[PDB]
């Protein structure tokens, strides 16, 4: 019964692959907004000087 | 032979499960502060205008 075990391993790897892309996308969305928010600030600072 | 395999697999799955709930937590704390700081910067702009 390696077959079922194999299959439980393959199901988990499927699920881990899904966590990874989910995590990279979340990281991506955060880097976007943090950098968008840093441009906003730096633009305000120029506007004031 | 299969018991040593299945037993290490279950152990690793258990550390992975903690890694996924740890990562979702860190990502929630980050979203919350990012959005907090976005509102502060918006409120300043509001006041300054």
């Amino acid at each position: 019964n390696q077959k079922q075990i194999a299959n439980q391993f393959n199901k988990a790897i499927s699920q881990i692959q899904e966590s990874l892309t989910t995590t990279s996308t979340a990281l991506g969305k955060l880097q976007d907004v943090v950098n968008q928010n840093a441009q906003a600030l730096n633009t305000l600072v120029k506007q004031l000087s | 032979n299969q018991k040593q395999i299945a037993n290490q697999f279950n152990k690793a799955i258990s550390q992975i499960q903690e890694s996924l709930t740890t990562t979702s937590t860190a990502l929630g704390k980050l979203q919350d502060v990012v959005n907090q700081n976005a509102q502060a910067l918006n409120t300043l702009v509001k006041q300054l205008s």
Binding site: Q8, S19, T23, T25, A26, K29 | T23, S24, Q31, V34
Partner: peptide, 30 residues
Amino acid sequence: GINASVVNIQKEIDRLNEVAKNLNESLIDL
């Protein structure tokens, strides 16, 4: 024209907690 964006990754956060409970289904019954 100065505006800070909000981020929304609540669906990814939720997905990770979900995948984690779903991994329970792949544990091998010895």
